[PDB]
Symmetry: D2
């Protein structure tokens, strides 16, 4: 029987690439999304046309709040409801925008940037474990955490807390046979808002090929970590960055 995976923020870009690759490997998938309903449903439709009844969507805001635990509980419940099991969780959804130190309130920015990057992964990890073979969680981290974007303090804090979660959860869940790992892109799909000149500035920094990672290349590392070829790997974060993090200023 086929295993099942939850991928958060899976309607487009890297999340979709991960969902597609998991599906192609034989997984049934929960495509979680927040605002991108049309894109989520379109993806699910495509996957179901490939194999009937192997993809569902699940909407949730992952901003921190007093109901976020219930929302995260429900995302995991959706996978059991659809598929009768949940073997893999991929924590991909992520808010990403500057929060300079010197029209959202700061409370809102904290809730979105720390909620999506750290607290939702933590809650989803609790629910995934409590509901529980090759079980694992993969956290989408960031290879540039130690050389961060200027004025992205809250985003950086969130990704650092996600490294902490990866370690803490690997240590604590190892007795239950749940592995917990991360994949840390350097530059992959650039933001849709970014102009080509700015994109090329980033591309030219990358030693290996002077180009960003494809979404599929990030997905490849995720697929590795969930596979039987990684059955002794837990608490590891695989950088997928073409050498970018090695390049001094």
């Amino acid at each position: 029987e086929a295993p099942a995976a939850v991928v958060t923020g899976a309607a487009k870009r890297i999340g979709r690439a991960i969902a597609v690759k998991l599906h192609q490997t034989g997984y049934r998938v929960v495509i979680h999304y927040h605002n991108s309903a049309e894109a989520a449903v379109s993806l699910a439709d495509e996957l179901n046309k490939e194999r009937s009844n192997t993809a569902v969507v699940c909407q949730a805001d992952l901003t921190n709040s007093n109901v976020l635990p219930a929302s995260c509980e429900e995302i995991i419940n959706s996978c059991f409801r659809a598929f009768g099991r949940c073997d893999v969780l991929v924590n991909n959804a992520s808010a990403f925008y500057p929060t300079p130190l010197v029209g959202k309130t700061v409370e809102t920015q904290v809730a979105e940037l720390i909620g999506t990057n750290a607290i939702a992964p933590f809650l989803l990890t609790m629910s995934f474990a409590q509901r529980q073979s090759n079980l694992s969680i993969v956290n989408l981290c960031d290879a540039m955490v130690d050389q961060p974007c200027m004025a992205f303090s809250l985003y950086n804090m969130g990704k650092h807390a996600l490294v902490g979660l990866t370690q803490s959860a690997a240590l604590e869940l190892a007795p239950y046979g749940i592995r917990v790992n991360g994949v840390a892109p350097g530059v992959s799909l650039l933001p849709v808002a970014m102009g080509e000149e700015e994109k090329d500035k980033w591309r030219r920094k990358v030693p290996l090929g002077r180009r960003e990672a494809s979404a599929e290349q990030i997905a490849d590392a995720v697929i590795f970590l969930v596979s039987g070829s990684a059955q002794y790997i837990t608490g590891s974060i695989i950088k997928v960055d073409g050498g970018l993090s090695l390049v001094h200023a």
Copy 2:
């Protein structure tokens, strides 16, 4: 005149030691507290006996909430009001307790652990910078990569605090504000910890089989705020007697 420092959670233990050493170095000090009013005021009394009107207290809950930004703004403001300047911020206040993955609600645990260890430091940092040998020192944790079992939220908080230290060092460098950390291993053990478990921890420490005194932790803070650290920013100084080097 004399420089001024804000120390969060300064009533007891490591915070108190840090406040005392800054004061002894010549700083005027804002002694922040949440529940420990009596201890905070007693420290203030002691420091003001030494030099009149050089210590004040400031109460605030640092749990994450809708009012946390205003609370952090007011802590920084209290330093400007008392002393007309704020040269140093020490982010020491910290909740510490287990949050297993498998009667506080989980959202309260998130608010307290991530609030005290990360979000409050962030807001205090914003307010401190907006109001401007200026520096910030964050109390980190040498065991972040080898964490206590079932302490995931605490560990996330401390990791986020490393992130803030790096991001703020980078962004505040142009303003001449240095941002560093001190990472204790085992210092003063929890009051709740039984003496047998305390001894198990002490015996793990390569350098002297004992915990760091609060004063030993404060020494590294004093270094980091001093003119001997004027080129140091984005650095976290481990003060753990080699504990983090010891394998399982």
Copy 3:
């Protein structure tokens, strides 16, 4: 045409499993050995029974010395002479024994421990690049920051190997040669070791309270040389079942 790989110290244990898994994946292999001729040849004969003319052995001492550069050039040249190409280099061979600070001379210890773990990888890297999905995989150690007591030279050698992996990744990226590491925690235990001492290590590992098989270490090498890792360079994959996360 089938690609070709050099695996150092490939006669036994992890290097043998790497060589076998590469061979199963379709590589022709140079099985480097130092003292284990019989085991090297038996592996070669086995692989060649599977597919004719797909394995050769190559003897060399990787101790540091003024002939080490030529020995390393010769190892690489052997792969070209056998197979007309060299796609993959696996730096696996490694001396490992204590060197306390307080019958081998210290300079022999330095030559063996630094030569096998660091300088030989460096020279083999040079020769591999000069001769050019090309990649190098260095066998590192998940415990370099929490090292075995009295293994300073070994630990220095493994840290230097991390430096090599990063510096070579950076410098060889323009030629399309990726350079990565795999860092075991506890894998195959020393053959010497009593089961009672073996079990002490096994019990420290969160994930399954057992050591990694050589095949599990090999699986990570196979991933890193594969098309699924085409954008990965300068990365060290820990394969340690959580061992390195466990405090003292």
Copy 4:
């Protein structure tokens, strides 16, 4: 009885500043040097003019070889011979030059770069410990070890091995009360051979003041680590880089 310190490569630049500040703090000093004899003797003259019988020179090549152990033993012995004790060892001497992967032979480049940066510190640490209060060793590391200079592999390997030595020796020597720490400069005194345009490029990269560290600012972190205010600190490396290592490519 004043304490005594050995500083390697102490005739010029950073090692000189360290020797001077240690002396100002009350230490007697062995000024080790290799080629800079005039400078070494001139420094020793200055220190002794300030307090008689408080400085000696010691010449030694720290290139790796079969006689490196004896040379390192001799450096430590020189401190006991002059001062009757040896409280502090500062591993500062260092070769620094590129060694591309693609007039010195490679054997020589390995010997000089790995010898000075890693093997000499190791043998000096061994001799120091065997000859044995506030005892400590301070290793001059490099903040840029993870974002290395292009084509400096052997130098980088040497500095990484020195991080390994700092940790391993801190662990093993802790029961003897000998602390082992490091100081990791980013950009400090630039190479004498470096053109001024290049020095300025480097300076512009440093967030904290857009200037390199003085030798004195590096020395300040060394004197902190040797001092009574660092008595619980062992196995720590203090970055003194003005934020340089935080800046992405």
